[PDB]
């Protein structure tokens, strides 16, 4: 719930919870990604490193299936060889920290697969809104 019985909505606040709990409080990690002699050179390069990281993630999000949508589905099915788990054991038992280790070897195939899926769907929408 909230308040006196709360798994705490703070910054990184539920990081050891199960992913069904961390599927709600998701803007709380988004909005703390902007804010923040010779010392001002170090300070300004910290802030432009922050906004360059945030712009690279917004641009990597946008050329897949979602512009800024924050919860985003797409059109490629999920392979058995990436996880071999059921749904209930990852949404009712496992944490996101452990999940990032379990799909650590299966990165940089899923992103190229999203890129082909979105680019072929954009050309499908292009021809489908062309031919009518």
């Amino acid at each position, epitope marked *: *719930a909230v*308040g006196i*019985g709360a798994v*705490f909505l703070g910054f990184l606040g539920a990081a050891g919870s199960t992913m069904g709990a961390a599927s709600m409080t998701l803007t709380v990690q988004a909005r703390n990604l902007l804010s923040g002699t010779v010392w001002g050179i170090k300070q300004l390069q910290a802030r432009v490193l922050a906004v360059e990281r945030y712009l690279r993630d917004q641009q990597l999000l946008g050329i897949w299936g979602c512009s800024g949508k924050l919860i985003c589905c797409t059109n490629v099915p999920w392979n058995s060889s990436w996880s071999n788990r059921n749904l209930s054991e990852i949404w009712d038992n496992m944490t996101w920290l452990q999940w990032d280790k379990e799909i650590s070897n299966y990165t940089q195939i899923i992103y190229g697969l999203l890129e082909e899926s979105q680019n072929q769907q954009e050309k499908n929408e292009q021809d489908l809104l062309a031919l009518d």
Partner: antibody, heavy 122, light 104 residues
Framework: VQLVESGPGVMKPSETLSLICAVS??????????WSWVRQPRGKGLEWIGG????????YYNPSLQSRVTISRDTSKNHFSLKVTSVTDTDTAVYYC???????????????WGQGVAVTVS | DIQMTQSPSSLSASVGDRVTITCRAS??????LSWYQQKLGKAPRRLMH???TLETGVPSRFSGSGYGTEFTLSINSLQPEDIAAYYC?????????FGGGTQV
């Protein structure tokens, strides 16, 4: 450890009601303690104003009185303040600041309260 | 926003009795009420959190039960200091809202 409130109560309407709650014995920078301001006029029920946590920034109110009230908190004097602008006659009440446990992270807290101060607005 | 409703309102029982006070919510909360006891001109002393487990410094003569939306306080051995106010309060979503008010 005791929570001392301050603020005289006799004022004129549509003005600056200000209440201070402060701790003696411990500090307000202790983590995971729900702070609450709750008022009660005599003859009427227990009315909820404000509640937050000790160790974050995001703060919460009742939406039905939200343009009149605001809260503040600082540890340089260990003050926990309620501010009311545009007070009606419906705020003549006793007022309680409260420190409550969060129950998932703290089995060892002391559910502290203020004594309640009486503010009378003519 | 969630409203709370507390029944009954005005009570006066004899000594050694067992009084029950229920309260109901507007949507399902399922685990979340706290019980508070406020004497005359005083700070409210909390009975319990989470409706089934108690606070230290309070004996076993009070109880709470229920599940879901309707919940129930039961005092099995009435003491003469019980003529006061009691309140069930939700903590499901902000804002917190108390009960109506028990005049026992």
């Amino acid at each position: 450890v005791q929570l001392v409130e301050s603020g005289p109560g006799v004022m004129k309407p549509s003005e600056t009601l200000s209440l201070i709650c402060a701790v003696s014995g411990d500090t307000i920078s202790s983590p995971y303690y729900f702070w609450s301001w709750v008022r009660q006029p005599r003859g009427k029920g227990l009315e909820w104003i404000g509640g937050l946590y000790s160790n974050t920034m995001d703060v919460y109110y009742n939406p039905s009185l939200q343009s009149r009230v605001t809260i503040s908190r600082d540890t340089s004097k260990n003050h926990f303040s309620l501010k009311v602008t545009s007070v009606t006659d419906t705020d003549t009440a006793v007022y309680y600041c409260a420190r409550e446990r969060v129950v998932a992270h703290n089995y060892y807290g002391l559910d502290l309260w203020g004594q309640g101060v009486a503010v009378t607005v003519s | 926003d969630i409203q709370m409703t507390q029944s009954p309102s005005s009570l006066s029982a004899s000594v050694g009795d067992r009084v029950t006070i229920t309260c109901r919510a507007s949507q399902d909360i399922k685990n979340s009420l706290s019980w508070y006891q406020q004497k005359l001109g005083k700070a409210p002393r909390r009975l319990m959190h989470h409706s089934s487990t108690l606070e230290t410094g309070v004996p076993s003569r009070f109880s709470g039960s229920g599940y879901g939306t309707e919940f129930t306080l039961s005092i099995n051995s009435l003491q003469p200091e019980d003529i006061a106010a009691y309140y069930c309060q939700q903590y499901e979503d902000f804002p917190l809202t108390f009960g109506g008010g028990t005049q026992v």
